[PDB]
Write a protein that holds these residues in place. Sequence first.
Motif, PDB file in Angstrom:
ATOM      1  N   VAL A   1      52.778  27.961  34.284  1.00 37.08           N
ATOM      2  CA  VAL A   1      53.330  28.630  35.454  1.00 37.08           C
ATOM      3  C   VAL A   1      54.644  27.979  35.851  1.00 37.08           C
ATOM      4  O   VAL A   1      55.635  28.659  36.121  1.00 37.08           O
ATOM      5  CB  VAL A   1      52.319  28.601  36.612  1.00 37.08           C
ATOM      6  CG1 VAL A   1      52.991  29.001  37.908  1.00 37.08           C
ATOM      7  CG2 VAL A   1      51.163  29.518  36.310  1.00 37.08           C
ATOM      8  N   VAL A   2      54.654  26.650  35.911  1.00 34.49           N
ATOM      9  CA  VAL A   2      55.865  25.899  36.236  1.00 34.49           C
ATOM     10  C   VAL A   2      56.983  26.249  35.266  1.00 34.49           C
ATOM     11  O   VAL A   2      58.145  26.450  35.659  1.00 34.49           O
ATOM     12  CB  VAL A   2      55.559  24.393  36.213  1.00 34.49           C
ATOM     13  CG1 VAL A   2      56.839  23.587  36.311  1.00 34.49           C
ATOM     14  CG2 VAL A   2      54.593  24.034  37.325  1.00 34.49           C
TER      15      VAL A   2
ATOM     16  N   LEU B   1      57.442  29.039  33.273  1.00 31.10           N
ATOM     17  CA  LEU B   1      57.912  30.376  33.620  1.00 31.10           C
ATOM     18  C   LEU B   1      58.725  30.364  34.908  1.00 31.10           C
ATOM     19  O   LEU B   1      59.778  31.007  35.007  1.00 31.10           O
ATOM     20  CB  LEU B   1      56.705  31.307  33.746  1.00 31.10           C
ATOM     21  CG  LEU B   1      56.875  32.778  34.122  1.00 31.10           C
ATOM     22  CD1 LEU B   1      55.739  33.562  33.509  1.00 31.10           C
ATOM     23  CD2 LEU B   1      56.891  32.992  35.631  1.00 31.10           C
ATOM     24  N   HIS B   2      58.251  29.609  35.900  1.00 30.78           N
ATOM     25  CA  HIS B   2      58.866  29.593  37.217  1.00 30.78           C
ATOM     26  C   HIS B   2      60.321  29.170  37.128  1.00 30.78           C
ATOM     27  O   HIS B   2      61.228  29.937  37.474  1.00 30.78           O
ATOM     28  CB  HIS B   2      58.088  28.651  38.140  1.00 30.78           C
ATOM     29  CG  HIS B   2      57.067  29.335  38.995  1.00 30.78           C
ATOM     30  ND1 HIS B   2      56.090  28.645  39.682  1.00 30.78           N
ATOM     31  CD2 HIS B   2      56.879  30.643  39.288  1.00 30.78           C
ATOM     32  CE1 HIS B   2      55.342  29.500  40.357  1.00 30.78           C
ATOM     33  NE2 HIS B   2      55.799  30.718  40.135  1.00 30.78           N
ATOM     34  N   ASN B   3      60.567  27.949  36.655  1.00 36.07           N
ATOM     35  CA  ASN B   3      61.956  27.513  36.537  1.00 36.07           C
ATOM     36  C   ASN B   3      62.716  28.401  35.562  1.00 36.07           C
ATOM     37  O   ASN B   3      63.867  28.777  35.817  1.00 36.07           O
ATOM     38  CB  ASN B   3      62.039  26.051  36.110  1.00 36.07           C
TER      39      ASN B   3
ATOM     40  N   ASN C   1      64.322  32.153  37.141  1.00 31.01           N
ATOM     41  CA  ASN C   1      65.440  32.163  38.075  1.00 31.01           C
ATOM     42  C   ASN C   1      66.520  31.152  37.713  1.00 31.01           C
ATOM     43  O   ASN C   1      67.702  31.413  37.969  1.00 31.01           O
ATOM     44  CB  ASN C   1      64.947  31.926  39.502  1.00 31.01           C
ATOM     45  CG  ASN C   1      64.651  33.223  40.232  1.00 31.01           C
ATOM     46  OD1 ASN C   1      65.086  34.295  39.812  1.00 31.01           O
ATOM     47  ND2 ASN C   1      63.916  33.133  41.332  1.00 31.01           N
TER      48      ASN C   1
ATOM     49  N   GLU D   1      46.784  35.986  38.099  1.00 31.57           N
ATOM     50  CA  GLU D   1      48.079  35.746  38.719  1.00 31.57           C
ATOM     51  C   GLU D   1      49.154  35.540  37.664  1.00 31.57           C
ATOM     52  O   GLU D   1      50.273  36.039  37.801  1.00 31.57           O
ATOM     53  CB  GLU D   1      47.991  34.544  39.656  1.00 31.57           C
ATOM     54  N   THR D   2      48.821  34.829  36.589  1.00 28.68           N
ATOM     55  CA  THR D   2      49.778  34.638  35.508  1.00 28.68           C
ATOM     56  C   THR D   2      50.077  35.950  34.802  1.00 28.68           C
ATOM     57  O   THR D   2      51.205  36.175  34.365  1.00 28.68           O
ATOM     58  CB  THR D   2      49.254  33.612  34.510  1.00 28.68           C
ATOM     59  OG1 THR D   2      47.958  34.014  34.056  1.00 28.68           O
ATOM     60  CG2 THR D   2      49.157  32.250  35.156  1.00 28.68           C
TER      61      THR D   2
ATOM     62  N   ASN E   1      52.496  37.515  36.793  1.00 34.74           N
ATOM     63  CA  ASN E   1      53.756  36.816  36.558  1.00 34.74           C
ATOM     64  C   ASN E   1      54.428  37.311  35.288  1.00 34.74           C
ATOM     65  O   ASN E   1      55.653  37.442  35.237  1.00 34.74           O
ATOM     66  CB  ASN E   1      53.521  35.310  36.472  1.00 34.74           C
ATOM     67  CG  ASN E   1      52.883  34.753  37.716  1.00 34.74           C
ATOM     68  OD1 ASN E   1      52.068  33.834  37.654  1.00 34.74           O
ATOM     69  ND2 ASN E   1      53.237  35.320  38.860  1.00 34.74           N
TER      70      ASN E   1
ATOM     71  N   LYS F   1      56.050  40.476  36.059  1.00 34.71           N
ATOM     72  CA  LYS F   1      57.263  40.239  36.837  1.00 34.71           C
ATOM     73  C   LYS F   1      58.402  39.751  35.954  1.00 34.71           C
ATOM     74  O   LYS F   1      59.564  40.117  36.165  1.00 34.71           O
ATOM     75  CB  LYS F   1      56.988  39.226  37.944  1.00 34.71           C
ATOM     76  N   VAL F   2      58.090  38.900  34.981  1.00 31.70           N
ATOM     77  CA  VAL F   2      59.112  38.437  34.053  1.00 31.70           C
ATOM     78  C   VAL F   2      59.613  39.591  33.208  1.00 31.70           C
ATOM     79  O   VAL F   2      60.810  39.691  32.918  1.00 31.70           O
ATOM     80  CB  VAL F   2      58.563  37.299  33.180  1.00 31.70           C
ATOM     81  CG1 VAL F   2      59.584  36.917  32.126  1.00 31.70           C
ATOM     82  CG2 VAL F   2      58.212  36.116  34.044  1.00 31.70           C
TER      83      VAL F   2
END
Lengths: 152, 93, 279, 54
Positions: free
Chosen positions: C258-259, C261-263, C266, D34-35, D38, D41-42
Motif C-alpha cells: 500500500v505504501v 502504491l501510495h508514494n 502521486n 481496500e487494495t 486502490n 484508483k491507480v
Amino acid sequence: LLKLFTTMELMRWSTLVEDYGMELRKGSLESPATDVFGSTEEGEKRWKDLKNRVVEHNIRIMAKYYTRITMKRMAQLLDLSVDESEAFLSNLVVNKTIFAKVDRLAGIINFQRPKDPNNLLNDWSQKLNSLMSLVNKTTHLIAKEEMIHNLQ
Amino acid sequence: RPANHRQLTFEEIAKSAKITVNEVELLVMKALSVGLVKGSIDEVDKRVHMTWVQPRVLDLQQIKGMKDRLEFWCTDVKSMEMLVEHQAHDILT
Amino acid sequence: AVQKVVVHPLVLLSVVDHFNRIGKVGNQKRVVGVLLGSWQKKVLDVSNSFAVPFDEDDKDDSVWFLDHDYLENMYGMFKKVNARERIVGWYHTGPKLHKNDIAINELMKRYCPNSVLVIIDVKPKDLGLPTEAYISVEEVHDDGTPTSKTFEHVTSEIGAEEAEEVGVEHLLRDIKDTTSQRITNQVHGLKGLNSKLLDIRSYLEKVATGKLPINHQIIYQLQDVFNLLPLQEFVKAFYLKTNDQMVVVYLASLIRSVVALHNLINNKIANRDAEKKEG
Amino acid sequence: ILDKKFHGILDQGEGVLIIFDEPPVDKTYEAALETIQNMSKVVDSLYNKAKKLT
C-alpha cells in the motif's frame, strides 16, 4: 462431606456409602440419618443425586490436565462405569453449562475448555506479561542484591 | 534435569515414587491442592507433564556453576544484541 | 508501603543546588536533608523538601544535627505557606549507605508515621533511574531476630505531578517527539547485560567470599523467575510464532505494498508534471 | 450446511461428523478489498498520467 468442598474428594463411592450408611447405624443422634437416608423415594434418590454430585463436581475439579482423556480411562478415574460415564457425559453435555468438545471418532476426548482455538492473544499475554515480569526481576535484582551487599 | 521432554512419561514416577498408575493422578491433584507445581498432565499417553515448579533450597555448587546459564545469558543476549545492532548498524542515522 | 511517589524534578533541583552548597561551603560530603510530602495514598508526592544543616562524624555514622529552629520552627512558617507537603522523610547521598540512616529515620518517625530515607544521586551517571525511596520495614528473617529496620527498596518513579514545563521544556533545547527504537534497544540490551554481569560477579563472590545471604531469601526464587523458561524448547511457541509471523508478514506485505502504491502514484504525478509540463 | 444453517463436516467413510467455522478475518478481507479499490484508483490515475504526458 465438608471436606468434599475441595478437590471433590474423588472417592470410591462405596466408601462414602459406608460413611453415610452408618449414619443409620448410629447408637447416638440418628435423626440426621432418617432425614437423609432413612428415606426411600427421596433418600435413595438422595444417593442417586449424590452420584450426580460426585460425577459432575469431579468434572468441575479435574478441568486442569484435560485436552487428552479417554472415554474408558474417564470412567477409570470417575469411580463409575463407562456407560455410566456415557450417560453422565450425555447429561452434563446436553446441560452443557461448560463448553467441552467430544467425539467417539476416538473416544479420547475431554470435558474441555474452548480447546484453545485462539490467535496471538495467547502468545501476546505470554510474551508481554512474562517479559514484564522479567523487567520486574531486574528492577528488584538490583535492589535486593544491593541489600544483601549492604554490610559489605 | 533442566532439559526438555517436559511431557514426561509416568514411568519414572511409578518406579521411583512408589506409586501406581491409578494413583499418579492423585499424586498430582494433591499437588494441585499443595500448589507448588501445576502440570498439564497428559492422559492419552498417560504422560505426567511438567510445568512450572518450586525449585530447591540451595545448590551452592550450582550457585557457582550457574555461569553456564547466567553468563550464558549475559554474553549471548549481549552478543545477539550486538548482532541485531550490527546488522542494523549504519542506520544509526 | 508505597509503590510510587511524585518525584518532581523541582525537588531534584533543590537537592542539586544544596549539594552544590555542601560542596562549596567546605568538605561536608554526604548530602543529607529532610524530605517533605503529602500522603494522599500509597501513592505520594515529593515536590517540596529541604536539606538540614547536619554533619556526620567519620567514625560512628550515628552522628547528626537536626536543628528544631531549622526544621520544627521552619515547619510552622512553611505550615502557613502550604500544609499539604508535610514532614514525610529524608535522604542521604553516598551510593550504598552509612550506619546512621536507620537511627535518623526512626528519630524522625515521630514526625511521619511512614518516614523515608532516599539514597540521592549527586552525579547522574546511571544506566536508568536516579535516587529511590526506602520506607520503614519490618523484615527480619525466618530466624526472626529483633526487628531490623534496614529500609527496603520502596519502589517509586519520577512523578511529574504537573507540567510546569513553561520553563522546564524551555530548558531542554535538545530533543523532539522521537517518532529512537534503536536507542531503546541498545540501552535495554546493554543494561540487562551489565546487570547480569553484576549478578555473576556477586554470585562468584557468594561462592568465594559471600555471606549467608549467598541464597538469602529469594536469590533461589530469583533463579525461579529465571526458571520461568528453564533451548527452553519453545516448539509450541515455535509454530505459534510461525502463525504470528504469518500475521507479521501479512501486515508487512499488505501495508507496505500500500505504501509503495501510495508514494508511487502521486509522487510520479508531480514528478511528470514538473518534468515535462515545465518544458 | 449449504445455507450456513450448519458449518462443519459430516462423514460416511467414518460416520463421524465434525463442526467448525471461524470465518471473520477483518485484516485480509478489509485490507485486500481496500487494495483492490486502490488498484482501480491507480487504473483511473493511469489516464491522467497518459494525458498529461501526451
